[PDB]
Amino acid sequence: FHYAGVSAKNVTLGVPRLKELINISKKPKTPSLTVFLLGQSARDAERAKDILCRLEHTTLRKVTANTAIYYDPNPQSTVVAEDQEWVNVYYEMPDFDVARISPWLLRVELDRKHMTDRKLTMEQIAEKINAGFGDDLNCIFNDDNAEKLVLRIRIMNSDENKMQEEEEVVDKMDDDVFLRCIESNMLTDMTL
Amino acid sequence: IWGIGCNP
């Protein structure tokens, strides 16, 4: 305390910082990294902001306004009234529904302010989720023009039809418990 | 006892 606030970043100083340096502690109290920009990004604030976004960790939780799990028996049923339009669009030429579709629906809703602050893209988030998790999680993303940024996630189509698994016809972690586990994993570990 | 930047 009483350190002059040149920047909005706290720094250990005084006896505790001397202790950290002298002890060579593996865990500094305030580990910090000063980054200098090589090109015109140093001069121009927008490019510097781009670098800042590329250097700052962002989880799905940071941009997610609210998450809900609805049991949707049919994709055409559209238990949520809002998705009825865009779901229809995606199911005008349905993709990956050939195996099956999950009866449970994780309808994540993202805050537009956080998305535009981090300059994230719905295609970007959807690609990260779908590619990292694999074909098991199928995601439907809204248009950015739509008032609500909605990502509709469903469990593996082949796992739902169970033709691909074969083996024994026994539910593992049910499906909604597995979906909740997936939600927690996405919230804290997406690393978008 | 003075301020936030000084002493207590």
Partner: protein, 426 residues
Amino acid sequence: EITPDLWQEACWIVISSYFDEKGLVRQQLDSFDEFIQMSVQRIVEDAPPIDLQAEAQHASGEVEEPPRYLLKFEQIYLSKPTHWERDGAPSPMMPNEARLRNLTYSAPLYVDITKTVIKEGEEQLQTQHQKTFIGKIPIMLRSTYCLLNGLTDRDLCELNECPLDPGGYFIINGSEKVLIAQEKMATNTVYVFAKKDSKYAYTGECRSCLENSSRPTSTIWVSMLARGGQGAKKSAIGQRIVATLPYIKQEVPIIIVFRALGFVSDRDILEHIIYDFEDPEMMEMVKPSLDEAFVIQEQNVALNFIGSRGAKPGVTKEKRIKYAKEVLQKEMLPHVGVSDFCETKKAYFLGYMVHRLLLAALGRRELDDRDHYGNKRLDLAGPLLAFLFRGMFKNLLKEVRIYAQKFIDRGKDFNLELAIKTRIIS
């Protein structure tokens, strides 16, 4: 009828009256005074009556085999501070003479002891030893039991004592000793704190004690485990509430504790925990802990679960169940109740503890401050000497029991006067 701008005289007139009635050391004095009277009687009353009989194996036959000896300590008495000279004649001891001769300013303590003997012939005999001397209690100076009490300054000067001397100290071995008030955390109060490095995100503690009659504190924790730990089911369930009950080696799920108190149904447990069922956030908070305790759906099974984790295992299953039940009735939440059907009260208070933990977790209430002096109490001379006398009087009863048991196994007789060791208390 008002006193405006004449206030500087009025405030100091009322302050003068305050310090004229009381003075500066009225804490010490008052504490000590209260202690003596109330505390000693209470302790003598609160200690269990001495039960005693000869061993059945020692003597053949049952005609006189249970000669039950029962000792009850009726009432307490304190004389004015007295010195017993080498000749043996009691004399009043003035504090100044105690200082000069390096004596201790103390008063004798006498207890009426009633000995009732049942010889198995149904002819129980009660003999009351009145004014039995059990020890000597140091007397705080200028307290109600000090000789200097109620003496005008001229009388104090006649005794070579200062009129201005505050009192509030004891003369032990000729030296003036002052009991320093000791700070402590408040008892019978639920406090929710947060520990950063702990495995629990929040912990609610209640340092429960039954009017300080015994067991200085019986602390119980209800803590919500942190969600930082990552696992498949761990991520699915979220934070779970555990209870660090006294006399139990490890953590016990809270719902199991509620079912041990006889509340098996989940709806009743949540009625005690969540006072408003309509609020969804708290219900969602409680759900994982119900999931953890889904296995145990019976009171006896919950008691067995508690007993298995008890510090000392019980070989028999029903022994474990009985041990857990008695441990809950005595050790857990003693201030709420200690016997009979206090189980509903204990369930309500434990639900209050869990509910306050839930409010802290949801942010609806702020975490308690340990430094807030509302959460602090001050142990003066009274509570400290009361704790001391509890310990020493229990030891005195123990020694009386040992001597009595030897003489009773002999069957000759027992004498109260020989059993009592004044050395102990003094």
